Design a protein around this ligand. Structure first.
Ligand SMILES: [Mn+2]
Ligand SMILES: [Mn+2]
Ligand SMILES: [Mn+2]
Length: 430
DNA sequence: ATTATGACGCT
DNA sequence: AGCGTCATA
């Protein structure tokens, strides 16, 4: 009754850029705008690997992870932009810099948690209390929410899509009680008004469009964001959760897309998020561990407490390259040449980071993969990072991996290396 | 031969 | 510490 936590204490948003690397390339090259377009890395192997796809191109069935040669079969007029290559490798700097543009705009509104290169969470609880106080029990007009969907509406007693959005919004606003500054539905709505403003600013100041979700926690905000992409935002209320979850595949919720989610489905013999409500907290804990079980017990009821971390900057800076198939590194000087290439990119990015962000990395992580290993990393070793020097860093990396070579003679490397990875970590203020 | 990342959890 | 899981362009 009066003591049941409902997890409606916060207003959290997730803002996620639409087809982000594609938009970055479309801004730069107007010829790619409003076309089936994709971003590709490399070219030689089957036309290159697609890592971002415009919504026009998705209509033809083009997806991420597709080889460009295969995508061309679905969509002959597909336009392509290539990821930059520097020092023999893909270099993602243009996209990291475009990300910073967006993160700095979002930070004007609230402390953000950078969750990826193209998305951040915002805790808008405080900002909502402020906007409510100036509102002065003013109703919220539909015109203040021009791109917002209310999940689950319209419902009950027009065949166009924008018509449907407006009808749902009208029902939502009609039902609102703007008289109560502590009403969670009202707070979400004011949250959505602020996110319209945030999104307008992003687009005005960068040219990039984005989508967003507004809810009471990060997981619901993330899920909400995806419901009406592209270029729209979606409000998922506490009350909308039972219907939403009653047909929502478990794998759709963040963190459940892998082995754990598969095990929830297998062990409990269920399919949808809402079916989880029929288990006790102890029952879920028994199968999935203390932390996961409690998290599942609350999550299936729309409740989650994971805070929005105040972290706008990535806490690691890394450089990685695969050496597939026959390109696997089989000689010493090969290994040393590529460690230098990686190390030089790292030094470049590290030095820029120190200047911009007043910090220094203190640990260097070196990872490799060896042929045969299904695993993604075969081996990970750390050493001190005391100087931003590429030659020192590459020499040190070699030192930590020197012994992995199984060949008797030292000139050859075996078994051949199919991946090198250098990561700077453990930052301290400077 | 999707690749290049980046965060968090376990022991 | 090193490994594993999950995620995101
Ligand atoms: Mn995106
Ligand atoms: Mn994203
Ligand atoms: Mn995506």
């Amino acid at each position: 009754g009066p003591h049941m936590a409902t997890g409606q204490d916060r207003v959290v948003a997730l803002v996620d850029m639409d087809c982000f690397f594609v938009q970055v390339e479309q801004r730069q090259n107007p010829h790619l705008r409003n076309k089936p377009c994709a971003v590709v890395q490399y070219k030689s192997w089957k036309g290159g690997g697609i890592i971002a796809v415009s919504y026009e191109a998705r209509a033809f069935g083009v997806t991420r992870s597709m080889w460009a040669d295969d995508a061309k079969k679905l969509c002959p007029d597909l336009l392509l932009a290539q990821v930059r290559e520097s020092r023999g490798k893909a270099n993602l700097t243009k996209y990291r810099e475009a990300s910073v543009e967006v993160m700095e705009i979002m930070s004007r509104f609230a402390v953000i948690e950078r969750a990826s290169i193209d998305e951040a969470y915002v805790d808008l609880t405080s900002a909502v209390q402020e906007r409510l106080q100036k509102l002065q029990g003013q109703p919220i007009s539909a015109d203040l929410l021009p791109s917002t969907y209310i999940e689950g509406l319209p419902q009950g007693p027009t065949v166009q899509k924008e018509g449907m959005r407006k009808q749902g919004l009208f029902q939502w606003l009609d039902s609102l009680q703007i008289d109560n500054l502590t009403s969670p539905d009202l707070q979400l709505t004011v949250g959505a008004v602020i996110v319209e403003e945030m999104r307008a600013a992003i687009e005005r100041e960068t040219g990039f469009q984005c989508s967003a979700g507004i809810s009471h926690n990060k997981v619901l905000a993330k899920l909400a964001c995806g419901l009406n992409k592209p270029n729209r935002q979606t409000l998922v209320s506490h009350g909308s959760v039972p219907q939403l979850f009653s047909q929502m595949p478990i794998r759709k919720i963040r963190s459940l897309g892998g082995k754990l989610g598969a095990s929830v489905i297998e062990i409990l013999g269920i399919e949808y998020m809402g079916e989880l409500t029929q288990f006790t907290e102890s029952q879920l804990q028994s199968h999935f561990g203390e932390k996961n079980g409690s998290w599942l017990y609350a999550m299936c009821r729309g409740i989650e407490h994971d805070p929005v971390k105040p972290r706008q900057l990535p806490k690691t800076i890394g450089c990685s390259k695969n050496f597939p198939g026959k390109t696997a590194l089989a000689t010493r000087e090969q290994v040393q040449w590529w460690l230098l290439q990686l190390a030089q990119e790292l030094e470049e990015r590290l030095t820029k980071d120190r200047n911009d962000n007043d910090r220094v990395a203190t640990q260097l992580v070196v990872s490799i993969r060896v042929q045969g290993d299904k695993r993604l990393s075969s081996l990970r070793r750390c050493c001190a990072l005391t100087r931003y020097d590429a030659h020192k860093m590459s020499h040190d990396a070699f030192t930590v991996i020197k012994n992995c070579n199984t060949s008797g003679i030292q000139t050859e490397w075996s078994p051949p290396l199919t991946m090198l990875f250098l990561c700077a970590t453990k930052f301290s203020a400077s």
